[PDB]
């Protein structure tokens, strides 16, 4: 009976898989807001007009009733909801459908530190502020509540291409990959002379980088525990590693320096661009259909979009005061149409793609209420910039 | 395991270019349909007349010519797939395309290239004819040429040649320049409308003079930067190059920019453009493509140069031009106030194919991806112009929705007598996208109109008589009772007399330029004048099998094997004079003879030798295969047809040879040389083999000496098999060809037997068998005038002429345009036909394009609202019931705004669940289509068709839809299917099994949650594959008692789904499901397999990249001809946004392995046309068990019958017996209840 | 033969024998429920066993009041449920 805001693919999916159907190529959309019925959905757009599915405009913000800061923030891979992780230890669940909060799971003992589906989009691993790490089905069950997982908190989780292994790393200066069907470490990695701060697998390939306090990204095989190269460009610590899940042609890590890097595994470890903001870099996630699109994220908020085919030394799309304190943790739905964002001001901010019309398109500082009722029936709305 | 062929060949118009490629005499007009680069000769009249036709094993992405040395026919440059450059001389001698160089660029591209690369790798010709580029999305390969044919190829970013140039809009080669010149359109901040607020005039243009400077090794490129363009208007998408200098052809502005760099003048087209000469247009056009099609005509014998652009939406837009400087810079919308482009939509290749030396009044192909590729006549250039329709090319659009129903078999009997086509079903598509979008029922079998059906008694073979034009005479005669019965034009008997009637007759033909006639019966031959008298009788040692005759002669073959020809002394025509054949044919074994006249070895007799006149030559068929022919002043010196105890591709006329190379195996049972045809009646060499195999070979216009088959086009699918493998389509009735100078116009060859063939040439087409009713073919007769009579097995003679008022004869079947949008209403766009068996009737949900109202839950519209800019084009959905015996539409049943039907099926939902009375009711999921952020509305509409008292005037309106359950659900109803008595429909991530009760409450019984979006879903029974919009598809198994949706497997490799459907072939159960990215996806439920994780993770067995999107995937069962069928096997027919139909007919994993085993030794033994290596093309990254490609397996076919037996690794007559399986899979069609 | 919609239910598999065993899910899609066959006690109770040609109940399937949790496609207990996962009106609490 009460209205909200539904941002769902479904209806733009049909207005594709029409145009597809018939041949009738991706129409290019218009000012006027009659033309938002041919924005067709993410994986839709490709090269020249993937700036399209560049998530601008401000959705909705959502706080956990309690208000709790968020560690972590992973989406459901069918995209339907976000799960998001707790201090306390549990897992509230935003649906993508209205963002609306479903039943906390209670995950852990302690806080969930990161969570992380397989790409056979079923089961997901989870983690603790103490060692463990747990075997989730989609349907929420822990399977395999690995105890001994780490000696001390892990940090970041990531699964193989054929998701039969997955890697975990913690405050310990080692790296595990875990044989997921039994739930058993296959191969240890031996190296960093300090903490793993994050670690990313090869969505194609076997291969997995590692953030480490080392100031070094050593590429790992999952088969015999030995890195394959070690990138030494960066200098403080790096502290977050991905790839582009779509292709995995390009690793790319984060540093806690001002510094930011952008990998190709592909050519000889060459970086492609060394991205250096003021303020400090905290967390990325790549365009989950749009290969070289991704989006940092700053202490001082500051939500980064950028492309490596339009601007290598800049950011495409700066949003500076996304949100009010230092984003810690953001997701994509592998759909792509919302990109979740959260940060330590205990909020969880949503962002969809830009609507062709809108006068509060680009908002910059909103000093009472930046969730200002965005969930008024409607996408877009007239100007200061805040509602109520 | 699998094999793919194109049922339906591609006919969606994607290239085309005007260049002498196959001659030099006359401008030929290439059409790349998308596999299937057709040259036609256009003539003054403008009807295209197809010289030669070249199918090639992967898509033609883009094509241009480039012009080669010492030869004045310019050479073809090719691009197949993701990139990858096939230059293609055409070769006079063997008249096939033989590849210079193949230049593949996917692996360097790729290499270069951060993100994915485009599919559609577009390709840019230069005007200077010197460097061709191949570019991607900002990825550019450069092609040089030496001023070998090719030179070493470069592959570079765009910013290595300017210093900017981040993401390429389009690159294209600019007018006039000494050194060639590309012009980089790019926008360096990405700007699409929505970043329209931060960016302003974010697109720099950049003219870029290249050094293209060549080495035997490796090339080095300099680019030298003439001109550069900073500000310009976000939406400038296409650029088109004139003379003086760049057109830029924006979504809303178009700017002209010249060869020196700045902007003289640019032409806001609507509302949406905002900035240097301003040019404000108030009428609201706009160019929605991502590239627009576009021709651009010099000027000749002058300053007078044309440009015409082309929206989506089928509007000509000509342009004006001043060189000096540029002023009179203005867009026109030509008046089409006879509306015939209304018809058309997504013009995809626009090109100009007569030269006429004058700009004005010209003669224009348009290939469109909708609607019949035209071709124009623009007659004038104003700012009396009128253009017409001057020919058509028929384009079965995207096929849009694919089902089998019945169009013939509705009557049961027709004129009396049964049904040509009883028991006869088609797989009618839904063709067109747009205000001439229309059913095209794809026939398996040519559909005859009935002009005067008649019941016989104990017949064989009819032979009718036309003595001044005029049929007065019918012969009709029986083999097994001993009698020739001669009937009148009324049809009564012995009217007339002295007719040798006690015996068998063998052939009965007007005779003297039509005074004489000769009976040829079994013992002895006759003469008779008009009105029925003996004159001269001839007696035989031995039994007449074959006998042929033209105007003054007539050929006898005996039982023996000798021959004896006849000529009448034709200053009296009573009597009958011994032709002085040859003796050296006396010792050959000849099988049978024909009469024939035509300028085949004119050329090479002493008489008229280079002069094109029709000499009279007897051709023969040797029991050792080669067709033997002379004139009657032959001199004892024979000529031959060489290489047709091979039969391979190329048939030289020779003198010929006598030896012992004697190998007495007989597999041309009939040959004839016919011209075929409607317009262009081509000379066409027809071989029918024993096994009744139809080889066809053309009679080339050049070098008419020389016979030549394209044996990579498979044009003719096969009609038997030569190692005797299907027997059953010969051992009923003997197969004999007939061939017809004028059936409806169209020049047609029919072949009797249990399988009837036509031999249907269009001019748009090389001539096809296409199956000629469902009914049985004894012999046929030409009925008086443009019909004919033919006999069928049960005796019922029925005369038959061919509609051409909608039907097409070329896509190799033949095809019936149902155009259902009349005057008064026209149901723009049709898609998800549905057949209704319990109505016997189709239902079409149509789906006009209405302008879209961009809205909430309430009332109120989104903030942005503006009247006076042209609005988006939404939805506005509604199905029409169609009665196909008159095919008017009987029941539209209208959707509301926004609302587009996705899916509709019609179903075998249980009405009751323990009764079981599965009533057939549709089922239509509308989906009310509108914005991500407004919330997802959908509907799923079931109807059951009541047969209701009909209209007092019209019949066949004798049903309506019933809406007997609706309801508008929370998300988009985007797919239905009947799973098992009960139908699912999807929802927003959701997927509800309903279940109808007899009270008809729709109950949702089981439910689902699916990854983002069902594109498509179909159900085996109670199995499921219902396929996620990205995340690939879930196979789901389905439950009743307790009703669950059981999750069996998710597909691994997750894609953009398009189309789902199953293939079965028995044991395990396979799953076609189609890509975005044009890839069959077959994945099989192996829940035995370890690594397939307890069939929970289906596993990824083939891939397969299709030359389109395919549409609507479609399950129907497979004839299984040669073999038993113990499990009904299903074939997989899947239609394509190019307008092709494929079948993913599956196969038992013996009879795979040896086409397998074929296939592997066709591409590697025999050579590919762009040298493309199929097995290497129809692959893109998601077992090594690979999908065959049918239409390289077709090639054995085509090839030479020595090579053919050669190619088996007992097996080959195994082969065959599968070959013919996989043709004829389609004829169960053919099979009612 | 009946080729408009021939989507066939009675067509055999080599995957036939797998769907009995794994997942309780045969075919035939309206079989009757097997006697001789309890709940409580699972494949023990019918001589037959998991290759049963007819279906067995799940204790799930036959418990009364829908879940709310399943019908949000989250339900923990994705077994042993003290609730129904069958997404039928006639047991529903709104
Ligand atoms: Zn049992
Ligand atoms: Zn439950």
Redesign the interface.
């Known amino acids: 009976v009460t ?16 145009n ?20 067709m ?1 993410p ?2 757009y ?7 599915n560049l998530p ?1 405009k401000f ?1 909705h913000l959502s706080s956990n009733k309690v208000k709790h800061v968020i560690p972590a923030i992973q989406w459901t ?5 976000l799960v998001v992780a707790t201090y306390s230890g549990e897992f509230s ?1 935003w649906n993508a ?1 209205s963002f609306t909060f ?2 906390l ?1 209670q995950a852990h003992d302690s806080a969930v530190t990161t969570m992380k589906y397989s ?4 089961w997901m691993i989870s983690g603790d502020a103490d060692g463990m790490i747990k075997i989730w ?5 822990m399977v395999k509540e690995i105890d001994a997982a780490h000696t001390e908190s892990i940090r970041d989780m990531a699964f193989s291409s054929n998701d039969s292994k997955f890697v975990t790393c913690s405050d310990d200066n080692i790296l595990k990959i875990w044989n997921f ?1 039994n739930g058993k470490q296959e191969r240890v990695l031996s190296g960093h002379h300090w903490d793993v701060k994050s670690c990313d697998w090869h969505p194609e390939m076997g291969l997995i980088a590692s953030a480490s306090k080392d100031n070094l990204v050593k590429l790992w095989d999952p088969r015999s525990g030995n890195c394959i190269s070690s990138i030494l460009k960066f200098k403080h610590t790096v502290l977050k590693t991905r790839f582009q899940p ?2 995995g ?2 690793l790319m890590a984060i540093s806690k320096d001002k510094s930011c890097r952008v990998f ?1 595994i ?2 000889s470890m060459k970086e ?1 661009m060394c991205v250096r903001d003021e303020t400090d870099y905290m967390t990325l996630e790549w365009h989950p ?4 699109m991704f989006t940092l994220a700053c202490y001082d908020g500051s939500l980064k979009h950028f ?5 290598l030394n800049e950011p ?1 799309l700066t949003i500076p005061y996304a949100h009010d304190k230092c984003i810690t943790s953001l997701s994509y739905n ?2 792509g ?1 919302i990109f979740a964002t959260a940060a330590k001001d205990r909020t969880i901010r949503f962002w ?8 509060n ?2 908002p910059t500082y909103n000093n009472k209420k930046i969730n200002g009722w965005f969930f008024g ?6 100007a200061x910039x805040x509602x109520x | 395991m699998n094999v793919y062929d194109d049922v339906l060949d591609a006919t969606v118009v994607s290239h085309s270019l005007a260049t002498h490629f196959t001659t030099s005499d006359y401008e030929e007009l290439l059409v790349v349909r998308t596999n299937i680069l057709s040259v036609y000769r256009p003539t003054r009249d403008g009807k295209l007349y197809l010289t030669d036709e070249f199918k090639f094993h992967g898509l033609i992405t883009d094509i241009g010519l480039i012009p080669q040395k010492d030869s004045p026919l310019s050479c073809l440059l090719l691009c197949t797939g993701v990139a990858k450059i096939s230059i293609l001389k055409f070769n006079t001698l063997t008249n096939s395309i033989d590849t210079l160089s193949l230049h593949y660029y996917e692996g360097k591209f790729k290499g270069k290239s951060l993100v994915e690369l485009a599919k559609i790798s577009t390709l840019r010709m230069d005007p200077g004819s010197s460097c061709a580029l191949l570019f991607n999305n900002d990825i550019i390969a450069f092609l040089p040429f030496h001023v070998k044919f090719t030179a070493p190829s470069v592959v570079l970013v765009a910013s290595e040649l300017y210093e900017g140039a981040k993401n390429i809009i389009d690159i294209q080669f600019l007018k006039n320049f000494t050194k060639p010149t590309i012009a980089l359109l790019y926008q360096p901040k990405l700007v699409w409308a929505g970043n329209t607020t931060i960016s302003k005039l974010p697109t720099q243009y950049v003219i870029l003079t290249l050094n293209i400077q060549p080495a035997e090794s490796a090339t080095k490129i300099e680019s030298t930067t003439i001109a550069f363009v900073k500000e310009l208007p976000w939406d400038l998408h296409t650029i088109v190059p004139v003379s003086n200098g760049a057109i830029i052809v924006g979504t809303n502005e178009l700017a002209f920019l010249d060869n020196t760099g700045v902007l003289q003048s640019t032409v806001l087209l609507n509302s949406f453009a905002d900035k240097k000469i301003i040019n404000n247009s108030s009428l609201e056009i706009m160019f929605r493509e991502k590239n627009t099609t576009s021709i651009w005509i010099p000027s000749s014998k002058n300053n007078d140069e044309t440009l015409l652009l082309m929206d989506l939406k089928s509007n000509i837009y000509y342009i004006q031009m001043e060189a000096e400087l540029l002023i009179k810079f203005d867009i026109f919308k030509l008046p089409i106030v006879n509306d015939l482009l209304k018809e058309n939509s997504n013009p995809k290749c626009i090109t100009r194919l007569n030269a006429t030396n004058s700009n004005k009044n010209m003669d224009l192909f348009i290939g469109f991806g909708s609607g019949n590729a035209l071709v124009l006549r623009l007659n004038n250039l104003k700012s009396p112009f009128d253009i017409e329709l001057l020919s058509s090319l028929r384009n079965v659009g995207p096929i849009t929705s694919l089902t089998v129903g019945k169009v013939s078999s509705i009557d049961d009997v027709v004129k009396g007598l049964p049904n040509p086509n009883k028991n006869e079903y088609s797989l009618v598509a839904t063709s067109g996208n747009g205000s001439g979008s229309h059913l095209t029922v794809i026939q398996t079998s040519v559909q005859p109109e009935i002009e005067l059906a008649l019941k016989f008694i104990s017949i064989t073979q009819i032979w009718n008589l036309k003595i001044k034009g005029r049929d007065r005479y019918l012969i009709t005669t029986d083999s097994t009772k001993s009698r020739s019965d001669i009937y009148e034009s009324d049809n009564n008997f012995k009217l007339g007399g002295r007719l040798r009637r006690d015996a068998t007759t063998v052939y009965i033909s007007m005779f003297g330029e039509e005074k004489r006639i000769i009976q040829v019966t079994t013992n002895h031959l006759y003469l008779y004048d008009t009105h029925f008298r003996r004159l001269t009788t001839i007696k035989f040692d031995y039994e007449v099998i074959h006998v042929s005759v033209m105007d003054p002669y007539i050929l006898v073959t005996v039982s023996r094997g000798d021959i004896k020809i006849f000529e009448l002394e034709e200053k009296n025509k009573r009597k009958l004079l011994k032709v002085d054949l040859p003796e050296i044919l006396n010792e050959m074994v000849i099988t049978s003879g024909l009469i024939l006249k035509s300028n085949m070895c004119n050329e090479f007799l002493i008489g008229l030798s280079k002069s094109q006149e029709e000499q009279l030559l007897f051709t023969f068929v040797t029991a050792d295969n080669q067709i033997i022919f002379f004139t009657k002043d032959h001199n004892d010196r024979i000529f031959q047809l060489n290489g047709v105890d091979q039969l391979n591709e190329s048939l030289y006329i020779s003198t010929y040879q006598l030896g012992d190379e004697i190998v007495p195996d007989p597999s041309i049972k009939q040959v004839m040389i016919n011209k075929l045809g409607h317009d262009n009646k081509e000379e066409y060499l027809t071989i029918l083999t024993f096994g009744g195999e139809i080889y066809q070979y053309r009679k080339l216009p050049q070098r008419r000496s020389r016979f030549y088959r394209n044996v990579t086009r498979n044009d003719l699918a096969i009609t038997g098999a030569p190692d005797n493998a299907y027997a059953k389509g010969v051992s009923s009735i003997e197969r004999i060809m007939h061939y017809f100078p004028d059936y409806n116009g169209y020049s047609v060859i029919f072949v009797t037997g249990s399988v009837p063939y036509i031999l249907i040439k269009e001019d748009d087409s090389t001539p096809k068998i296409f199956k000629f009713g469902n009914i049985p073919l004894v012999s046929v007769t030409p009925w008086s005038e443009r019909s004919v009579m033919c006999v069928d097995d049960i005796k019922n003679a029925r005369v038959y002429t061919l509609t051409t008022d909608n039907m097409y004869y070329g896509n190799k079947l033949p095809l019936k345009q149902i155009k259902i949008s009349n005057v008064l209403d026209d149901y723009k766009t049709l898609q998800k036909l549905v057949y209704h068996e319990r109505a016997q009737l189709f239902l079409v949900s149509y789906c006009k394009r209405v302008p879209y109202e961009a809205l909430g839950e309430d009332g109120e519209k989104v903030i942005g609202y503006d009247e006076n800019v042209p609005h988006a084009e939404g939805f506005q959905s509604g199905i029409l019931l169609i009665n196909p015996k008159s095919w008017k539409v009987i029941d539209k049943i209208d959707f509301p705004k926004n609302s587009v039907v996705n899916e509709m099926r019609s179903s075998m939902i249980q009405i009751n669940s323990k009764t079981k009375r599965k009533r057939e009711y549709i089922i239509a999921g509308v989906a009310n289509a509108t914005t991500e952020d407004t919330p997802p509305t959908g509907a799923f509409h079931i109807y059951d068709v009541i047969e209701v008292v009909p209209e007092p005037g019209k019949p066949d309106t004798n049903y309506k839809l019933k809406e007997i359950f609706q309801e508008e659900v929370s998300g988009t109803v985007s797919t239905v299917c009947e799973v098992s008595g009960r139908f699912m429909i999807s929802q927003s991530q959701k997927v509800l099994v309903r279940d109808i009760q007899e009270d008809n409450s729709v109950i949702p019984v089981a439910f689902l949650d699916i990854p983002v979006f069902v594109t498509d879903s179909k159900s085996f029974g109670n199995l499921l594959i219902i396929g996620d919009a990205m995340q690939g598809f879930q196979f789901i198994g389905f439950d009743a008692e307790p009703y669950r949706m059981i999750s069996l497997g998710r597909s691994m490799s997750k894609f953009q789904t398009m189309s789902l459907e199953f293939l079965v072939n028995g044991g395990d159960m396979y799953f076609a499901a189609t890509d975005a990215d044009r890839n069959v996806h077959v994945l099989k439920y192996a829940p035995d397999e370890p690594n397939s994780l307890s069939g929970q993770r289906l596993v990824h067995c083939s891939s397969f990249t299709l030359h389109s999107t395919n549409s609507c995937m479609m399950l129907l069962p497979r004839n299984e001809e040669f073999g038993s069928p113990q499990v009904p096997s299903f074939q997989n027919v899947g239609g394509q946004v190019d307008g092709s139909v494929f079948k993913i007919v599956p196969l038992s994993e013996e009879k795979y392995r040896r086409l397998y085993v074929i296939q592997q030794q066709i591409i590697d033994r025999e050579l590919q046309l762009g040298g493309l290596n199929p097995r290497m093309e129809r692959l893109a990254n998601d077992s090594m068990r690979p999908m065959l490609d049918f239409n390289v397996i077709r090639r054995f076919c085509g090839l030479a019958i020595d090579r053919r037996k050669s190619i088996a690794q007992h097996a080959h007559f195994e082969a065959w017996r599968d070959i013919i399986n996989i043709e004829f899979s389609m004829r169960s069609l053919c099979q009612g209840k | 033969p009946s080729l408009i919609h021939p989507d066939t239910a009675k067509y055999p598999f080599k995957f036939e024998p797998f769907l009995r065993q794994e997942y309780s899910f045969s075919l035939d899609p309206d079989r009757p429920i097997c006697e001789f066959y309890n709940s409580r006690e699972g494949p023990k109770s019918c001589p037959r066993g998991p290759l049963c040609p007819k279906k067995h109940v799940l204790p799930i399937f036959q418990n009364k009041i829908v879940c709310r949790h399943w019908l949000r496609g989250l339900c923990k207990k994705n077994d042993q449920c003290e609730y129904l996962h069958e997404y039928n009106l006639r047991k529903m609490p709104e």
Do not use: C
């Open positions: 209205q909200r805001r539904s941002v769902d693919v479904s209806s733009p999916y049909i207005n594709l898989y029409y597809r159907r018939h041949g009738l190529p991706n129409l290019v959309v218009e000012p006027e807001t009659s033309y938002t019925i041919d924005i959905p994986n839709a490709r090269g020249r007009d993937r700036v399209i601008s959705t891979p069918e995209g339907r909801r669940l459908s479903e039943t799971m790409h056979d989009s079923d089905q989609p349907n929420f069950s069907s779509t292709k042609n390009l190709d592909r050519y492609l259909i749009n290969e070289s492309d490596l085919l339009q601007n495409i592998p759909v149409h969809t793609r830009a609507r062709p019309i809108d006068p398109a680009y029936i409607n996408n877009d709305i007239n």
